[PDB]
From Swiss-Prot:
GO terms for molecular function: chromatin binding; DNA-binding transcription factor binding; enzyme binding; FAD-dependent H3K4me/H3K4me3 demethylase activity; flavin adenine dinucleotide binding; histone demethylase activity; histone H3K4 demethylase activity; histone H3K9 demethylase activity. The keyword Thylakoid does not apply. GO terms for cellular component: chromatin; chromosome, telomeric region; DNA repair complex; histone methyltransferase complex; nucleoplasm; nucleus; protein-containing complex; transcription regulator complex. Transmembrane segments: none annotated. This is Lysine-specific histone demethylase 1A. Its EC number is 1.14.99.66. It comes from Homo sapiens. FAD binds at S118, E137, R139, R145, M161, V162, E612, T621, V622. The chain holds residues 172 to 833 of 852 of the full protein. Residues 3-102 form the SWIRM domain. It is linked to Cleft palate, psychomotor retardation, and distinctive facial features: A syndrome characterized by cleft palate, developmental delay, psychomotor retardation, and facial dysmorphic features including a prominent forehead, slightly arched eyebrows, elongated palpebral fissures, a wide nasal bridge, thin lips, and widely spaced teeth. Cleft palate is a congenital fissure of the soft and/or hard palate, due to faulty fusion. ACTH-independent macronodular adrenal hyperplasia 3: A form of macronodular adrenal hyperplasia, a rare adrenal defect characterized by multiple, bilateral, non-pigmented, benign, adrenocortical nodules. It results in excessive production of cortisol leading to ACTH-independent Cushing syndrome. Clinical manifestations of Cushing syndrome include facial and truncal obesity, abdominal striae, muscular weakness, osteoporosis, arterial hypertension, diabetes. AIMAH3 affected individuals have low fasting cortisol and ACTH, but excess cortisol is secreted after eating. Residues 129-644 are annotated as: Demethylase activity. It is found in: Nucleus; Chromosome. Acetylated by KAT8 in epithelial but not in mesenchymal cells, thereby regulating the epithelial-to-mesenchymal transition. Acetylation by KAT8 reduces KDM1A association with nucleosomes, thereby decreasing histone H3 demethylation, leading to transcription activatio of target genes. Polyubiquitinated by JADE2; which leads to its proteasomal degradation. Deubiquitinated by USP38; preventing it from degradation by the 26S proteasome.
């Protein structure tokens, strides 16, 4: 399934056309199905060629000469496809050798705001399509939310760090293009309590099993019983979880009752049986007395079979009595769960939650119960890997040959029915400004900046109500890292990551997860959920000291030396960011990701948006950013260069 593979690795269905191709090739979709069959093979065959060697530019010519008969004969179609694929960044994207040198004559001038992966990506596309493009970047470096600390042999990612499963992941190609050393993440993640001791294999699995059950429960509750709104306010995921935990607590209390009742009842029965027995003892005494008084050869006979008969009664009860102490002692021995989760059990569960508040980069209570995982259906297949040599190798390589004006903070974007103006300023001398003119503006500003109040950059005219409203609706999270550079490795080198369980639900996200990813003696500590923001208000020294506390508790003092170097991120504070990444907030939905990507026109689309918060199916990711870049590059090329 080679050509079949290529289509999959391209997030496309190998045996049918997408609504897209259907739109661009309406003559085929609504025509001989025999042609559709051909179209696809051309598409799948072209991608293949590209994917089987993404280092060199795949051309229309090169494609045509590699297809086999009878395809190689339909020159036109091949072209039509190859073009389509290229325009939409499915081939010839990332970084490759050009066998067909760029034309000197550059048509159309577009300015890109921000030089993040989304930004660079589009930039390289618009330029390969022969347009005049310049990226204005506030920072004194490219990468944006991709930041890598490099000093000596020391390497560590302060921003994104994980690559999620190569299957169908565009980064896979890019990985190959920049020679980025990716290393899978070993699943073994040992958890250690507040005091420092590990968590027995058993509990880890138990509490974790419970963690999944709860989430599953909220999912059912949401997409089955439609419990998605309460008191007119949207239901958050944490809201559900807390409710689902409440119910579990009730079910336990309930089974404790029915048991206490079984007990008491069985104790009442005994106390009663015990009594009549004490009366039969009394009754038997009225006979082992009296009885012993000439007709006695029949009186003794009548008194005997009498007195005995009251034992074929008594010791008979001792029987249907033991059958109660047996039933009793047995229950008081097999009591049900005293509680749903112990105090310590709950702390571990909170770790799993915090671990989630990491993946979503926000407190569970702010997440939409219904849509927080709106894109689950789009995950790539494969093990998650980590960028061993620093995820920055990507943006750096992507910036090669581009016109990037670092230290240039944009403060105003003007767009009229006849052109655009981008006003920026030097971040080193706010006195001087710049007025770049262009036919189009591509805004890859983070949602965090777009949400800023007062506004970091001004739009003239102001953004539509429908755009600002979505911005205000969408969630933008925060996550932080603490980089600990040591001169020795006192941790387990075979262990990729290890957890630290907090003491309280509130602080469950404080340095809960430690990462061992690099060549040098380096550990990363994560700060998730509520902690994230708060911790930013604490000095590097203190925040580091607390890390050491944790580590020392795990490995023992004296075993944990002082860090020769420490790096602490504060992404919310970062004016060029204002948070880590977007998330579907309770009250918002995947539709806002679409509304974001929607271009703004005042008769012809002028202002365009790209970036992780604009790509609905692959939101909050480096690859998400990447695609949103290619996406707009294509959309813009179609508008300004039209057809090829």
């Amino acid at each position: 399934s080679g050509v079949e593979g290529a289509a999959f690795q391209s997030r496309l269905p190998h045996d049918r056309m997408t609504s897209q191709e259907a739109a661009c090739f309406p003559d085929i979709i609504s025509g001989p199905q025999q042609t559709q069959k051909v179209f696809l093979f051309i598409r799948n065959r072209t991608l293949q060629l590209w994917l089987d060697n993404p280092k060199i530019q795949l051309t229309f010519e090169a494609t045509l000469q590699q297809l086999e008969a009878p395809y190689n004969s339909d020159t036109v179609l091949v072209h039509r496809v190859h073009s389509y694929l290229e325009r939409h960044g499915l081939i010839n994207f990332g970084i490759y050798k050009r066998i067909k040198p760029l034309p000197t004559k550059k048509t159309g001038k577009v300015i890109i705001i921000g030089s993040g992966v989304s930004g660079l990506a589009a930039a390289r596309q618009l330029q390969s399509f022969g347009m005049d493009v310049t990226l204005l970047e506030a920072r004194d470096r490219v990468g944006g939310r991709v930041a890598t600390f490099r000093k000596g042999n020391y390497v560590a990612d302060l921003g994104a760090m994980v690559v999620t499963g190569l299957g169908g992941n565009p980064m896979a190609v890019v990985s190959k293009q920049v020679n980025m050393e990716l290393a899978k993440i070993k699943q073994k993640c040992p958890l250690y309590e507040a005091n420092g001791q590990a968590v027995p294999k058993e509990k880890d699995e138990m509490v974790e099993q419970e963690f999944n059950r709860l989430l599953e429960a909220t999912s059912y509750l949401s997409h089955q019983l439609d419990f998605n709104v309460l008191n007119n306010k949207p239901v958050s995921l944490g809201q559900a979880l807390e409710v689902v935990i409440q119910l579990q607590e009730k079910h336990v209390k309930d089974e404790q009752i029915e048991h206490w009742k079984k007990i008491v009842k069985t104790q009442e029965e005994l106390k009663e049986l015990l009594n009549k027995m004490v009366n039969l003892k009394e009754k038997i005494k009225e006979l082992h007395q009296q009885y012993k008084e000439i007709t006695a050869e029949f009186l003794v006979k009548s008194k005997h079979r009498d007195l005995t008969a009251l034992c074929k009664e008594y010791d008979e009860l001792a029987e249907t009595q033991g059958k109660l102490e047996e039933k009793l002692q047995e229950l008081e021995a097999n009591p049900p769960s005293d509680v749903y989760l112990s105090s310590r059990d709950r702390q571990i569960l909170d770790w799993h939650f915090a671990n989630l508040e990491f993946a979503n980069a926000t407190p569970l209570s702010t997440l939409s119960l219904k849509h927080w995982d709106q894109d689950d259906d789009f995950e790539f297949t494969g093990s998650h890997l980590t960028v061993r040599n620093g995820y920055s190798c990507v943006p750096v390589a992507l910036a090669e040959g581009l016109d990037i004006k670092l230290n240039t903070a944009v403060r105003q974007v003007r767009y009229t029915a006849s052109g655009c103006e981008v006003i920026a300023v030097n971040t080193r001398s706010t006195s001087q400004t710049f007025i770049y003119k262009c036919d189009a503006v591509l805004c890859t500003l983070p949602l965090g900046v777009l949400k800023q109040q007062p506004p970091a950059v001004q739009f003239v005219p102001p953004l539509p109500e429908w755009k600002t409203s979505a911005v205000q609706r969408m969630g933008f999270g925060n996550l932080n890292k603490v980089v600990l550079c040591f001169d020795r490795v006192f941790w387990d080198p075979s262990v990729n990551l290890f957890g630290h369980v907090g003491s309280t639900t509130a602080s469950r996200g404080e340095l809960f997860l430690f990462w061992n990813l690099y060549k040098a003696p380096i550990l990363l500590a994560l700060v998730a959920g509520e902690a994230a923001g708060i911790m930013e208000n604490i000095s590097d020294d203190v925040i580091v000291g607390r890390c050491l506390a944790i580590l020392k508790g795990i490995f023992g003092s004296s075993a944990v030396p002082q860090p020769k170097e420490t790096v602490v991120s504060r992404w919310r504070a970062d004016p060029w960011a204002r948070g880590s990444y977007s998330y579907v907030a309770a009250g918002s939905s995947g539709n806002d990701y679409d509304l974001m990507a929607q271009p703004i026109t005042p008769p012809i689309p002028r202002l365009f948006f790209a970036g992780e918060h604009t790509i609905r199916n692959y939101p909050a990711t480096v690859h998400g950013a990447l695609l949103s870049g290619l996406r707009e590059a294509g959309r813009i090329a179609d508008q300004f260069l039209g057809a090829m």
